[PDB]
Design a protein around this nucleic acid. Structure first.
Lengths: 124, 141, 129, 180, 30, 56
RNA sequence: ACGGGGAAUCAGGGUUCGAUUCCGGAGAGGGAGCCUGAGAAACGGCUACCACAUCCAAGGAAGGCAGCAGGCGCGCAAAUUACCCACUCCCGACCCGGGGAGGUAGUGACGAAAAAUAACAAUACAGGACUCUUUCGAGGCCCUGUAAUUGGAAUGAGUCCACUUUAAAUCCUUUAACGAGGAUCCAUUGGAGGGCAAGUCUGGUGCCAGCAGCCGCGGUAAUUCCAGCUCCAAUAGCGUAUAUUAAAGUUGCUGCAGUUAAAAAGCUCGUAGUUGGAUCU
């Protein structure tokens, strides 16, 4: 009845200052385990703080058994901020995506192509 | 007899290529006169404007009035005659409205006891004749 | 005029065997005819034959044992590779149990099985069964 | 340009004569005796058997010491023996041509769960498979056309979450118990 | 009605094909 | 030769309402029923090999 | 007619196709001429002319979607004026910026794969028994049905929660709650004379209306039209039109014919073409 975590294809990436693994989650009667619960379970399993653990891509198999995803355990929070994708940091509340859209930026850029000089800063 | 020589490939290929033109279907497909003469111009279907309702007499062994319509095709301004297949379906067609017409099923040949008619109406006013016949749809107002 | 003396010889053997005759005369003789006849005889399809030597072009008297259904020539002598041999066998032979296609290869004149044994191709001379 | 793949093929062929009475009789016999949904399932099994026969015929035309014939014939015979259609002692290419369509239809998961006793019939077998009551080894299998392998034959159970297997009686039983 | 009789009489009539089919049904199949 | 009669027979055909009947089985159940009717039931047979929709 | 890789069909031969994502070529409304640059006769560069066309205060200015969306037109014939650089890669001075390349979703029965629309049990019939045997009958052994009998068990279509997914979502997958009896949570498309599977049943019509690929049906029992019932073919699909392949050994190399069915020149000569006797270990 307890969610069980296993680590399949483990590698110590000194080039990116982390450890990479394939995470197997056994939840025979429960929904797909939240990424948080997996982060604390891996933190317990690898004796680290949970905030250096980034887990993603969890695919639940057909039939309701195991779920398979990927995990990284970083040496430190600074290395995680340096090496992680910005979206996986924002999932932890460590990054804020640009508040604008593609259309607004594109039309602004094409508007400043008409003005020359310091007036290029007046268009928005 | 025919030539059987290891160096007769030109003779055999050329004779076959010349003799293929005496094939009626091959010549009809590859001469280009039939495509020019075809009112649809190689299309499977064509949209047209109904000019008038015409009654076509069935050929001599049978006896009936085949209710057809003369239509003028929008693509090339040609005038064809198209059968309105089922019964009461001529009442679904007015004058000067658009109809989709397809072939009659013999690849440009008349079908049954309908002389000189090789097309059939499929749609009228963007509504299929089958839907109007079965009552599934009504012609627009 | 006559081309393909082997075609004449094979047609003569076929016509004589279909009439139930015991011997057939073949003229003119040639090396290819003698080799084709030897291949036929090694498989028990004709029997012994005698080469009459006249000083122009020999004749052959072939003893017929009525085990021959059809001996035929394939004109022209198409070049046959080891891959095309199966297709030629399907076209010509009445069964995969018996019948032979005779080829002229650089290793000599031989049936198709012997050409497969020596891993060689050549030109098709004819067939017999 | 796209990163997609357009590889697809049909797994069946429709018969040339649409209303051959004898063929209709045999196909209906197969459908009824194996609990099939339509004629297309019969034609699918017919097509895979036909392609196996085509491969065997192509290989049998080759020399008995051709490395390609040896390799591909051994692979085909191994794949046939593994799925339980060909006997391990009949390991020659000529026994492929003796195979019948009913040999492949007997290896379906539906047929197997009927033969193993988990179902009262073959249609009960199909509705039991489609309702997620059957697992193969540890994996729940939903597909009645699942071709059961020989090593997978002995592990066909009732699933650990089914009313017929583990606990949690179904929706109807729970509703009835609640209503009294 | 015996289909052999029906075929004998009506084989050349509008129902020749139908009586032929009925005769073939009776002749082989049981 | 007139178009006055264009829907004659269909217009003058008396209208009969379709009768209500239980739904036909679909899919595997229909094939099961067909197989049972043609290969497990023999009572309709009398030796004449009559058709399945015989009316005489 | 862009070429090829290749596609459909195909016993062995072959026939037809290839605008279309990969490679190569070409073009950017049509021509022409150039600048810059390593690289362009570049068009999301310039110059002119031809055609079209925008704004104007009439002096002048500006243009090129066969890029992504979108519109009109054309037609039998083809989707969103969406989200994003997270992936794949590319460009730049750049670990950082940008990319309608590309990815994601939307519309989508082009087409391809899997696959629901019910399963089971108990009584009443019916069938057979490898039961007594007695072709009278006794018969829950295996079976079948309008029971539109009875009964509970099963489940997902759907609604919905939380995860998971993802750049953010959606979709699958997972979990919980509700979710089936006329399980009304209802399968259709074409047919029933033959070819070709399945009604000379009933009503209407009466060479009319219509059916009919072909043969044919209909002129007062229509096995064929219009319908009701019933049946059968495929089935989440099925009918129609057209192109094409097999069938076509009706283009015949394999492999066709040519007295009379279509067909051998009126007859010879004759160059090319094609084909050529034996013979050398």
């Amino acid at each position: 009845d307890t969610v069980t975590i296993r680590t399949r294809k483990f590698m110590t990436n000194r080039l990116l200052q982390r450890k990479q693994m394939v995470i197997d989650v056994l939840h025979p009667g429960k929904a797909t385990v939240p990424k948080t619960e997996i982060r604390e379970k891996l933190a317990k399993m690898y004796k680290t703080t949970p905030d250096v653990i980034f887990v993603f891509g969890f695919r639940t198999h057909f039939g309701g058994g195991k779920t398979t995803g990927f995990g990284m355990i970083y040496d430190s929070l600074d290395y995680a901020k340096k090496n992680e994708p910005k979206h996986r940091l924002a999932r932890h509340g460590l990054y804020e995506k640009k508040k604008t859209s593609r259309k607004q930026r594109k039309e602004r850029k094409n508007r400043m192509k008409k003005v020359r000089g310091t007036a290029k800063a007046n268009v928005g | 007899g025919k030539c059987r020589g290891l160096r007769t490939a030109r003779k055999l290929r050329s004779h076959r290529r010349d003799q293929k033109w005496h094939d009626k279907q091959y010549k009809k497909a590859h001469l280009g006169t039939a495509l020019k003469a075809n009112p649809f111009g190689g299309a499977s279907h064509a949209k047209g404007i109904v000019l008038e309702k015409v009654g076509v007499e069935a050929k001599q062994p049978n006896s009936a009035i085949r209710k057809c319509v003369r239509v003028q095709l929008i693509k090339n301004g040609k005038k064809i005659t198209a059968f309105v297949p089922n019964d009461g379906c001529l009442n679904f067609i007015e004058e000067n409205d658009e109809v989709l017409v397809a072939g009659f099923g013999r690849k440009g040949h008349a079908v049954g006891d309908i002389p000189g008619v090789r097309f059939k109406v499929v749609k009228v006013a963007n509504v299929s004749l089958l839907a109007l016949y079965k009552g599934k749809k009504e012609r627009p107002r | 005029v006559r081309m393909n003396v082997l075609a004449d010889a094979l047609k003569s053997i076929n016509n004589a065997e279909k009439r139930g005759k015991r011997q057939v005369l073949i003229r003119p003789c040639s090396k290819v005819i003698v080799r084709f006849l030897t291949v036929m005889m090694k498989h028990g399809y004709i029997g012994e034959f005698e080469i009459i030597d006249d000083h122009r072009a020999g004749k052959i008297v072939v003893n017929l044992t009525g085990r021959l259904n059809k001996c035929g020539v394939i004109s022209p002598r198409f070049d046959v590779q080891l891959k095309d041999l199966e297709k030629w066998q399907n076209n010509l032979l009445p069964s995969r149990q018996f019948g032979f296609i005779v080829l002229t290869t650089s290793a000599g004149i031989m049936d198709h099985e012997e050409a497969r044994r020596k891993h060689t191709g050549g030109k098709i001379l004819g067939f017999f069964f | 340009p796209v990163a997609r793949s357009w590889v697809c093929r049909k797994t069946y062929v429709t018969p040339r004569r649409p209303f051959e009475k004898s063929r209709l009789d045999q196909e209906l016999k197969l459908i009824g005796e194996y609990g099939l949904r339509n004629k297309r399932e019969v034609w699918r099994v017919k097509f895979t058997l036909a392609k196996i026969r085509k491969a065997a015929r192509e290989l049998l035309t080759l020399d008995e010491k051709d490395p390609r014939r040896l390799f591909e014939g051994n692979a085909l015979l191994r794949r046939l023996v593994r799925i339980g259609v060909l006997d391990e002692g009949k390991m020659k290419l000529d026994y492929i041509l003796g195979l019948k369509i009913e040999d492949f239809l007997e290896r379906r998961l539906q047929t197997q769960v009927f033969k193993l006793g988990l179902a009262k019939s073959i249609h009960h077998a199909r509705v039991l498979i489609r309702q997620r009551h059957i697992r193969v080894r540890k994996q729940v299998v939903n597909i009645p056309s699942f071709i059961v392998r020989l090593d997978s034959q002995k592990h066909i159970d009732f699933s650990l979450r089914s009313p017929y297997g583990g606990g949690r009686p179904g929706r109807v039983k729970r509703k009835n118990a609640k209503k009294g | 009605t015996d289909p052999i009789d029906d075929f004998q009489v009506n084989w050349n009539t509008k129902h020749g094909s139908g009586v032929t089919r009925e005769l073939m049904r009776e002749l082989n199949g049981g | 030769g007139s178009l006055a009669r264009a829907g004659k027979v269909r217009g003058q055909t008396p209208k009969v309402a379709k009768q209500e009947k239980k739904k036909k089985k679909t899919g595997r159940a229909k094939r099961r029923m067909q197989y049972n009717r043609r290969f497990v039931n023999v009572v309709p047979t009398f030796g004449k090999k009559k058709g399945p929709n015989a009316n005489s």
